[PDB]
Amino acid sequence: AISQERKNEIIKEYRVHETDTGSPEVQIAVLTAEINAVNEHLRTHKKDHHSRRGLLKMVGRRRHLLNYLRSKDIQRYRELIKSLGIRR
Amino acid sequence: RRRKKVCYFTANGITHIDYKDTELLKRFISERGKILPRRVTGTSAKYQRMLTTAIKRSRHMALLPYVKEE
Amino acid sequence: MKQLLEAGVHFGHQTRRWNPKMKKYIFTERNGIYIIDLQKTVKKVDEAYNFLKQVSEDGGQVLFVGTKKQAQESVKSEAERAGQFYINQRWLGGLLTNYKTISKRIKRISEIEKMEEDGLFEVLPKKEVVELKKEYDRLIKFLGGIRDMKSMPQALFVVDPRKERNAIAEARKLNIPIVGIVDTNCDPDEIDYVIPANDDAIRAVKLLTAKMADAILEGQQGVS
Amino acid sequence: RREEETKEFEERVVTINRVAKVVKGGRRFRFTALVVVGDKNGRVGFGTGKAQEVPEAIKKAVEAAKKDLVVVPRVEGTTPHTITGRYGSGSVFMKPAAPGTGVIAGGPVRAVLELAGITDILSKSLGSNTPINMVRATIDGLQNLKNAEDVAKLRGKTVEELYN
Amino acid sequence: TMTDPIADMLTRVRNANMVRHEKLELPASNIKKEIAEILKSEGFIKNVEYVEDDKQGVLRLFLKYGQNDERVITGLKRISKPGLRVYAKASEMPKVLNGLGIALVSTSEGVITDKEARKRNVGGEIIAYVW
RNA sequence: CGACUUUCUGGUCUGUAACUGACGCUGAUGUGCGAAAGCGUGGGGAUCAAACAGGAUUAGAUACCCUGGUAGUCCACGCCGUAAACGAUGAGUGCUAAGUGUUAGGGGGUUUCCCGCCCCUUAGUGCUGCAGCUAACGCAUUAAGCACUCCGCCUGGGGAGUA
RNA sequence: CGUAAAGCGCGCGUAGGCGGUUUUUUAAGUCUGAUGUGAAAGCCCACGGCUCAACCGUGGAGGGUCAUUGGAAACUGGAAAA
């Protein structure tokens, strides 16, 4: 939808430390949850324009940040991709 | 604004009504059934946009006629 | 001269729109109007006093415009006391760059005043006399009493810029040093000898005109 | 502004047109002619005017020409430096030249520069070919032209450390 | 995203010329301080004053104007801009306005006016003319 | 995009500033959406309305005019993929006089209580206008000004968007 | 590139182009010096000789997006750190 409760719950395990709120690992995780949610609703409703526009924008941003973490660090990319089971 | 006195909202807020207070239905509407728009009442834009849907719902209740000409 | 107690008469201006170029003169707006500062007013007025007196020292000549209402009765008094030519009404199109018409105007005046002696009125049909009398009346009225304008002037005084754009622009075309009262709603940089003072007040304009007349007079009575 | 008939002068006409005003019935025309005026020693000015006849029109243009005047910052019989004039798409471009070259430009602008007392100068008209706009652009370029003394006073330093 | 800070400073300078205000504000930089110092050393800048606050800048400069309120330069622009960077040898270095103007140029030993750069026989990447 | 209520769902701004520390902008090719009309598939058709019928005007009117009137306008899924699709103004960033409003906010003072008032800050949303700019008209912080990066495009008209 | 021909309808975005602030570092670009080379004839300059010129000769300069190598590190670029 999403909900602040489940968001705040899931970010605690993926945050790099307790006090942080950025750390795109957090962002990649919440974006992945968001894209699955919107994709389920978009399969529920085949025709619309805001949904697919949104999905494309968030996928683009997720890829941009995922590529950003590919140059800052090299293990983080791997641990996230095989933990979220994403970016084949 | 050159319309009537501003800040008519001094007697209502933050949200209203929707149907339980005829004390702000009949003031803001005419005698034939028509709505009084913002120009004569002097109220704000937001309160007008709420009272619009409010009468839409209240005429649904049969508490209020769509048009009262007889 | 200027002193702060004489600066206490000046208060407020007309407030319909204010040019952002002269915020520096503004002290602090209050009661819904803008007021002009007075500390710089004394210094500027003292200076303009000095320049006007210097103009008078060499035997100068200055013009007085009073086209605005509630100023004429003071403008004529101070100019006639001053001993220099004067205006309180219509500035006919061109009076500092159209010299070929001013000479003919004063020449027509010199012509048509004198025929009253040898017989002008009733000495002929009603048609011409009724025309010439109204001609003389309107000429002296809307031109003024000025009949001594002979040598092109080197400085001018004005009552208001906002009404008198066309003449202040004509003077800029003739690169003459300009001095005159400056409302807070007028172009500052069109005038080089500024006086940030009020103009609506009858007493304010009266005192400013009296002081300027005394300045021009003091400078003229000395060897020129 | 401040016309003077005290210096020497050289009248010079650029173009004449037969210009018409159409009314019901006939067709009214009034000749036009532009002129440039200078003493070819460092002072120049252009002029325009219109009348029903040639001599009266050109006299009007000349008498209006002295009223607009140009200081013509000049040095060594050449402009101090190179510039580009621009006025209403009538662009123009000038550049100094070694002595013995001479003014090379279009007819009107040649007359403008020959009559402002410049001997050797390089330039080429651009954009529009109508005499009036390029002549006015040329004069505009001369208005915003500066010399070594005109700048050395402004900047805190002096001449002989910055010089052409 | 700002593509070029030199373009910003020169636009600020010219836009200060068109309305005439003694003071202007602009995020500083080491190259910016150096070129401001050379601007003051030519004579175009009345005074220079760097300040520090979080984080960079902000360089405050005091303009200069003639007694009749006349702008000193008649134009000001850059040459080396992104995409098409430019360079200049020692002999090939251009004399804009000759002595009149100067040609700011960055060299292997530092940024200097056009003159010294041709005197020492060391060129560099030009940045902006001024005149 | 203007009927209401709910279910699900995408975006925007302000403040905050704790946080990630340049991760940004433009962006060929590629992909998708894309007015109305038009088409495939099945219904529905109360109105309105191409084609068409009658009459009237009209030298003549298959046009306007009046009365009907099918497809169509409607729905559901696909199809196509142009337009004066405009602000005839490409996107992103920074700077440059003002005043006046409007929409959703914020800070402060004035009031026993601001909800009554004012000032200040935002962002859009307008107008009048200075500098400047333009063939001129006009643009003017919602630049067609002052610059930078990137993309698209033009190099006379007809031929011709034709082969 | 408002109206004159010229901003596609717009959106998501690859390749590419471009790049906030500071420090250290590399020296690829850049700047700078040398070395070899850019045939000769030709262009230009200077001189000389055909009676002069044309012409020819002589010598010089000039000519690389050139290679090697000695230095500089502001800027572009590479690396590392804020």
Under 8 Å CB-to-CB from D141, ≥6 apart: which residues? D83, D84, D85, D92, D94
Domain that holds residue E43: 1-73
Tell me the nearest-neighbour CA distance from D146 into chain E, angstroms. 9
Q: What is the DSSP letter of C10?
A: -
DSSP E60-110: EEE----TT---S-S-EEES--SSS---B-TTT---TTTTSSEEEEEETTE
- Whether residue A29 contacts residue A14, with contact meaning beta carbons closer than 8 Å, is answered with yes
Distance separating the N- and C-terminal Cα atoms of chain E = 30
Q: Are residues C87 and C159 in the same domain?
A: yes
Pairwise CB contact (< 8 Å): D2 & C175: yes
Dist. CA E38–CA D117, nearest whole Å: 38
Dist. CA C6–CA D52, nearest whole Å: 61
Dist. CA C130–CA A62, nearest whole Å: 96
- Whether residue B16 contacts residue B55, with contact meaning beta carbons closer than 8 Å, is answered with no
Please report whether residue C86 resides in a domain. Answer: yes
Domain extents in chain B: 1-69
Q: Which of D95, D162, D163, D164 to mutate to test the interface with E (most CBs of E within 10 A)?
A: D162
CA dihedral (D134, D138, D143, D146) positive or negative: positive
CB contact, 8 Å: C92 with chain D? no
For residue B5, which of B51, B55, B39 has the smallest C-alpha distance?
B39
Phi, psi at D28, each rounded to 5°:
-85, 130
Dist. CA B30–CA B28, nearest whole Å: 7
- What Cα–Cα distance (Å) separates residue C95 from each residue in C65, C162, D102, E13, E121? 11, 18, 46, 42, 64
Q: Is C26 helix (H, G, I), strand (E, B) or coil?
A: strand
CB contact, 8 Å: D64 with chain C? no
Q: Are residues C86 and C161 in the same domain?
A: yes
Cβ atoms within 10 A of the Cβ of E24, count? 15
B58, two tokens: 């209240």
Domain that holds residue D98: 83-154
- Whether residue E37 contacts residue E28, with contact meaning beta carbons closer than 8 Å, is answered with no
Q: Is C167 helix (H, G, I), strand (E, B) or coil?
A: helix
E76-78 and E47-49 strand pairing: unpaired
CATH number of domain containing D108: 3.30.230.10
Write out C170-191 in H/E/C secondary structure.
HHHHCCCCEEEECCCCCCCCCC
Q: Is C113 helix (H, G, I), strand (E, B) or coil?
A: helix
Q: Are residues C87 and C105 in the same domain?
A: no
- Whether residue D135 contacts residue D14, with contact meaning beta carbons closer than 8 Å, is answered with yes
Dist. CA D106–CA D125, nearest whole Å: 7
Dihedral class, residue E110 (left if φ above 0, else alpha if ψ from -120 to 50, else beta): left
Q: Are residues C99 and C129 in the same domain?
A: yes
Dist. CA B26–CA B64, nearest whole Å: 10
Cβ atoms within 10 A of the Cβ of C183, count? 20
C215, two tokens: 């300045």
- Whether residue C70 contacts residue C201, with contact meaning beta carbons closer than 8 Å, is answered with no
Domain that holds residue C127: 92-143
The C1' atom of F41 and the CA atom of B60 lie apart, in whole Å, by 40
Cβ atoms within 10 A of the Cβ of D57, count? 22
The C1' atom of F93 and the CA atom of E46 lie apart, in whole Å, by 30
Residues closing a segment before a gap in chain B (C–N exceeding 2.5 Å): none
Q: Are residues E62 and E117 in the same domain?
A: no
- Whether residue E95 contacts residue E114, with contact meaning beta carbons closer than 8 Å, is answered with yes
DSSP C37-103: -SHHHHHHHHHHHHHHHHHHHTT--EEE---STTTHHHHHHHHHHHTS----S---S-SSS-HHHHH
C62-64 and C155-158 strand pairing: parallel
Rg of chain A on CA atoms, in Å: 14
Q: Maximum distance among all alpha carbons in chain B?
A: 36
CB contact, 8 Å: C100 with chain D? no
Q: Are residues C68 and C100 in the same domain?
A: no
- CB burial class (10 A; 0-12, 13-18, 19+) of residue C139? middle
Dist. CA D59–CA D77, nearest whole Å: 30
- Whether residue E116 contacts residue E103, with contact meaning beta carbons closer than 8 Å, is answered with no
Q: Maximum distance among all alpha carbons in chain D?
A: 71
Q: What is the DSSP letter of B61?
A: G
Dist. CA D56–CA D35, nearest whole Å: 13
**Structural domain ending residue among the three candidates E44, E73, E102:** E73
- Whether residue E90 contacts residue E118, with contact meaning beta carbons closer than 8 Å, is answered with yes
CB-proximal positions of chain F, under 7 Å: 3-5, 8-11, 18-25, 32-33, 77-78, 92-99, 101-105, 115-117, 131-132, 134-136, 145-150
Q: Are residues E61 and E115 in the same domain?
A: no
Experimental method: cryo-EM
Dist. CA D31–CA C182, nearest whole Å: 45
- Whether residue C209 contacts residue C61, with contact meaning beta carbons closer than 8 Å, is answered with no
- Contacting D with CB below 8 Å, chain E residues are 42-44, 64, 66, 70, 72, 74, 97-100, 102
Under 8 Å CB-to-CB from D124, ≥6 apart: which residues? D92, D93, D104, D105
The C1' atom of F52 and the CA atom of A47 lie apart, in whole Å, by 39
CB contact, 8 Å: C169 with chain D? no
Q: Is E in contact with D (3 or more beta carbon pairs below 8 Å)?
A: yes
Phi, psi at D102, each rounded to 5°:
100, 155
- CB burial class (10 A; 0-12, 13-18, 19+) of residue C224? exposed
Q: What is the DSSP letter of B8?
A: G
The C1' atom of G8 and the CA atom of C158 lie apart, in whole Å, by 61
Dist. CA B37–CA A34, nearest whole Å: 43
DSSP E9-41: HHHHHHHHHTTT-SEEEE---HHHHHHHHHHHH
Q: Which residue has the tokens 């945050």?
A: A15
Q: What is the resolution of this structure in A?
A: 3.7
Under 8 Å CB-to-CB from D48, ≥6 apart: which residues? D32, D33, D34, D35, D61, D64, D132
Q: Are residues C53 and C64 in the same domain?
A: yes
Number of domains in chain C: 2
List the Cα angle C76/C79/C80 in 5-degree steps. Answer: 80
Dist. CA B4–CA B12, nearest whole Å: 17
Q: Are residues C55 and C66 in the same domain?
A: yes
Q: Is C20 helix (H, G, I), strand (E, B) or coil?
A: helix
Dist. CA C171–CA C157, nearest whole Å: 11
Q: Are residues C34 and C70 in the same domain?
A: yes
Cβ atoms within 10 A of the Cβ of A61, count? 14
Q: What is the DSSP letter of B11?
A: G
Residues closing a segment before a gap in chain D (C–N exceeding 2.5 Å): none
- Whether residue C16 contacts residue C184, with contact meaning beta carbons closer than 8 Å, is answered with no
Write out chain D in H/E/C secondary structure.
CCCCCCCCCEEEEEEEEEEEEECCCCEEEEEEEEEEEECCCCCEEEEEEECCCHHHHHHHHHHHHCCCCECCCCECCECCCCEEECCCCCCEEEECCCCCCCEECCHHHHHHHHCCCCCCEEEEECCCCCHHHHHHHHHHHHHCCCCHHHHHCCCCCCCCCCCC
Lateral strand order in the sheet of C178-181: C62-64, C155-158, C178-181, C193-195
Q: Are residues C159 and C224 in the same domain?
A: yes
Dist. CA D41–CA D70, nearest whole Å: 11
Q: What is the DSSP letter of B20?
A: S
Lateral strand order in the sheet of E59-62: E23-26, E59-62, E47-49
Distance of CA E5 to the CA centre of its chain: 12
Residues in chain C: 224
Tell me the nearest-neighbour CA distance from C175 into chain D, angstroms. 8
